[PDB]
Amino acid sequence: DPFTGPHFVEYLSWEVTGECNVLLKCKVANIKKETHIVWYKDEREISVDEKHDFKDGICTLLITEFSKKDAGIYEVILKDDRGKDKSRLKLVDEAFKELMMEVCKKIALSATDLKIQSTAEGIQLYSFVTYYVEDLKVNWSHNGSAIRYSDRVKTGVTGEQIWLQINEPTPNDKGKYVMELFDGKTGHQKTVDLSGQAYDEAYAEFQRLKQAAIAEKNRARVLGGLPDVVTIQEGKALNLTCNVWGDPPPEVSWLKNEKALASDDHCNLKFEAGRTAYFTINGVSTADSGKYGLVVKNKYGSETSDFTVSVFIP
Amino acid sequence: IDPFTGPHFVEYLSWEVTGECNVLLKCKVANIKKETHIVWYKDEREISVDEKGICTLLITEFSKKDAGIYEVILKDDRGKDKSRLKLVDEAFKELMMEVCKKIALSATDLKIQSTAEGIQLYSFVTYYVEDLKVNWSHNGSAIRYSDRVKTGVTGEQIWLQINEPTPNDKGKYVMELFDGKTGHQKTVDLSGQAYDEAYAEFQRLKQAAIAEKNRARVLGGLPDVVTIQEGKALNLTCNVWGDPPPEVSWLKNEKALASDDHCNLKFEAGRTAYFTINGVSTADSGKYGLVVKNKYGSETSDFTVSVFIP
Amino acid sequence: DPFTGPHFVEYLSWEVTGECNVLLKCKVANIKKETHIVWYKDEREISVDEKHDFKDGICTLLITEFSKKDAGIYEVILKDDRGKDKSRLKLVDEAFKELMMEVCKKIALSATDLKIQSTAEGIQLYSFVTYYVEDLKVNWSHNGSAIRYSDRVKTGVTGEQIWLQINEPTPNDKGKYVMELFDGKTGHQKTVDLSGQAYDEAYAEFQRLKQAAIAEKNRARVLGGLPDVVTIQEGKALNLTCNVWGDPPPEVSWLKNEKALASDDHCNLKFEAGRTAYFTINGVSTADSGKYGLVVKNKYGSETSDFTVSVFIP
Amino acid sequence: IDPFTGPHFVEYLSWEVTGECNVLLKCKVANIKKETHIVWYKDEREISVDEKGICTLLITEFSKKDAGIYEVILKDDRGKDKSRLKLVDEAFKELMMEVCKKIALSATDLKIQSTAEGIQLYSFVTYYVEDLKVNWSHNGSAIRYSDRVKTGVTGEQIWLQINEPTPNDKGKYVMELFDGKTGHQKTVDLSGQAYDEAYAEFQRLKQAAIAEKNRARVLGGLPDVVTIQEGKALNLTCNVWGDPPPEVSWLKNEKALASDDHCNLKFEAGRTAYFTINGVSTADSGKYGLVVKNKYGSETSDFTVSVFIP
């Protein structure tokens, strides 16, 4: 401590870390309480937090989600009534390029071996990265050739997932699959073989999923509009309405007290477009009380809707 | 008695008109034995009383059908005797006008009555009208019967229907009952204070009937309480009616509630209200109310949505 | 037809028939319409129906449920203004006795072979008669000896059923069983052998019935007092009460929304004497809505009671 | 400024009483530099304002605790200077009575107020009472404070509570505020038309409070609608309350219904009503009603039994 004014001991630098963040660093010395430590991106100040505290000895600032944005010129400016010292560190063309391709190695190294997983769309080829795409151009090889990209087989990425998909796989689609993660200078590969065993077993649950999923879409279904209990004064009239759906249009059927129920002039059921069932009583008498159910069903499934008309005599 | 000399007819078949215009066939028989038969005959065909000088036959609600020849025959093993009461043509034309005499000669004083439709004159015959001549005259003049002024007679009662009465319908109406060459009649003067009240009322019942027939009523379709589990959708409806067609509004807890996109109310062609919550939350539970009204009156239909959480 | 006055052609007599009724009869001749046919028991007139009709030729009157009551002196009296004829037929001591023992033969002849049937009380020995006991004294033989009557083995009759019962049968009770129907002069027998096969199989369903019937008596049981749905304004308090029973006293358990429910200060359950469960909410809040169940159970059985507190906010 | 001559105190620590009885510690400093420190001290211990000739320290809700010795020290590298404001013993006995002077000298005119419990006199001090001498005198006489006549002071407010007032409590009350050798007081005459209204009301609130506390209320236990299937048995209950204990009755559809053996009502110890249908038929469904009432008031609890057939 003098005075002559604070000063750096180590100048600005960068390293990569853990979840592939760029951490900047520098050591500083000769630091009064009342000293100022302030960072700047492109002369525009980074207004994170307090510039009225410090001790020793290292000074960091962490860049997150790092990418082309966090490029440009960074500087840490130490000051206080005694003096000022700048340490400037510059991240642009051919400085930055060195950095990007430097993150990716670390990204690329965290790339869980290629694994096989099927979905209702096809079979799918994914590897995990810890963690994340950027300027890490990406490529795939089926048996030593590029892959012609289509609507049946696509590539893509998702958060920390790198995937190849394969809608409507078939035997022609078995073979050797490889990943080319390209940082800028180097390349990196990871592989897997979609064949026999594994495959027969993926195309297995694939089929499963699709059949079940086609099914869980057009199964008949009561959408809503009945209550669970209605309670009505004897003699009054009653209108319930209930929307259904299915594809094919469904067959509705009514049930009072667990046996079938006939439409009729006094207890009239309608059905329409295969969209709307219409329960209706032109004067609820005690004998019209009990427990009703509506039951839609088509080829992919059934489903019922259960209500209770209880009645009181005024 | 004594064999022989067959049971005699001391007096032959004569009649009379007794009580509520019942005809009585009378006769006085003698020398009867408990082994004697008493049969009655209308136009050669057996009429049975109970089980066969006090023999009688009662004719109820006398008419043109009860006409024909009557005989009451008396016979056993000792002797047979016949009497006849012949009733066709002239001898019957005098029976009708005599059963009528008794009729006309007994009907309450004309009375006035207002109906929802008009003004009514009427008399009660403690008897029957079958083919009795009707005379309704207005001010000493035959009444022009139209689609406004009808006369008639319905079960025990005669009348004159004066639909939509003006004061022009005011005056001395007559009701002549005509039985042969005889005329017993009943008059009554529609004027002044009598009418002041009659017409007075008649209007009340009219205006009032107009209303109890167009005041917007709520027809039917709503429950009194629905219970639904949180999250499902509810679909009540309810037909209304009025003339002029009513205007509807709703309320959720005594406070007027307007339609949204979530709890939707509609109302089409003025005869149906659709109430439609769309994913009933607890918030949507409550005491709802549907009020229709028009110029003639109003009405509210209430229900309560309750909800449990599953 | 004269006249000299009606008269009998055959005098009063009796025969037995079908469902062992005594029918009386007689032929009559010379009958005007207006004639009188009237029957009398002990000079006291039988006032059945019309005495002002007749033709030819037979005249009957049927005694039903026949027994010691319908004894005494019967007479048919024809009259009308011409004359009178009586035919008298007398049914007392040694006339009647002849009749009683005469019905029974016909009763006894209709006696469906002895059959084996077990109940929850024991095994039971019954034969059917078409149809009915009276002065037909009845007796039983187990292996050629009278049967000592007790509280474990009783005799009896029921409408048209003649039975021997056998509470708590055991092997000592197998053997030859025979029926002695005794009219007055003769005797009649019908038999069956409670042994091996049949028996092992009766004592079978016997055991069944008793176990199941002991059970269907002390199984726990909700007797009543809950509704199926209650609907209450938010904030209000709620008292439900529900009586149960079992022997042994039962264990009650509550369930809200299909999992267990804890008594507590705000949702307090009691139970008492093993007779009365006590559901209670000191301010029903929406979160107290849902579907509850009460479930009593002891060693012989379970049983639940299901209700729903739905709530509306004023 | 200019090295050296350390930042000087032109005027030493003096005080004043400003605003809502806040005390101000004043001083006039000179020759300060932006590199100068300004620390405040109460009894040798650091008090921190914000972040260290206009220096000030605010004392909120002044009391006996804010007592002790004060110092405000000025120092940098050029020179250090101290001032002291000593506050213990006599010098502090004059601060209390001066903060009090400002207090007493500003309170609204006595006002009168009726509570459900009695009659209230009160004044609002736009300030604070900590240890301020209270003088309530009734007719120029010290008031005998008992279990009926309390004095006191609650947050910003002074008062005199006259429970169950008679006219004997009528007269010229005094409220002397005593700050040292000074006395500012407030009088007010409880008599005549002022009292006529005050007491007037006080009773209303009393009688009325008696009632809203014993009128038979229905406590809780009944549903608003029960639904049960035909034939099962129903067991509602409901605790009530009142003083004198209420009498209960029931109704089934606006018509008073009496207990039977089938649909049984009981009511024991006057705090619980048991309603108990025993095999609910359709006939037993309906709109039931439980009415309790006593001399102070009444209440009804409604519910509806509805039934379906299974």
Numbering used by the authors:
A (entry chain B), C (entry chain B): 1353 to 1666
B (entry chain A), D (entry chain A): 1352 to 1403, 1409 to 1666
Would you copy out the relevant sentences from the publication that reported this structure?
Members of the myomesin protein family function as molecular bridges that connect major filament systems in the central M-band of muscle sarcomeres, which is a central locus of passive stress sensing. To unravel the mechanism of molecular elasticity in such filament-connecting proteins, we have determined the overall architecture of the complete C-terminal immunoglobulin domain array of myomesin by X-ray crystallography, electron microscopy, solution X-ray scattering, and atomic force microscopy. Our data reveal a dimeric tail-to-tail filament structure of about 360 Å in length, which is folded into an irregular superhelical coil arrangement of almost identical α-helix/domain modules. The myomesin filament can be stretched to about 2.5-fold its original length by reversible unfolding of these linkers, a mechanism that to our knowledge has not been observed previously.
First, we determined the overall architecture of the complete myomesin domain array, including Ig domains My9–My10–My11–My12–My13, from crystal structures of a total of three filament fragments: the My9–My11 triplet, determined at 2.5 Å resolution; the My10–My11 doublet, at 1.9 Å resolution; and the homodimeric My11–My13 triplet at 3.5 Å resolution. As the available independent structures of helix-connected Ig domain doublets show only limited variation in terms of domain/domain arrangements, a reliable overall structural model of the complete C-terminal myomesin Ig domain array My9–My13 can be generated. This reveals a tail-to-tail filament structure with an overall length of 360 Å and a pronounced zigzag-type arrangement within the central, C-terminal myomesin dimerization module (My13), followed by a superhelical coil arrangement towards the two symmetrical distal ends. The right-handed superhelix is defined by almost constant twist angles of neighboring My domains of 26–27°, except the arrangement of My12–My13, which has an average twist angle of 68° and thus appears to be less regular than preceding parts My9–My10–My11–My12 of the filament. Whereas long six-turn helices are found in the My10–My11 and My12–My13 connecting segments, the corresponding helices in the other two connecting segments, My9–My10 and My11–My12, are slightly shorter, with about four turns each. Because of the smaller length of their linkers, My9–My10 and My11–My12 show limited direct interactions in their respective Ig doublets, whereas in the other two doublets, My10–My11 and My12–My13, the neighboring My domains are too far away from each other to form an interface. The complete filament structure of the My9–My13 dimer therefore is defined by an arrangement of nine rigid bodies, comprising eight Ig domains and the central My13 dimer. Although the precise orientation of different filament parts of myomesin in the sarcomere is unknown, available experimental data lead to a model in which the dimeric link via the C-terminal My13 domain in myomesin filaments is across the central M-line.
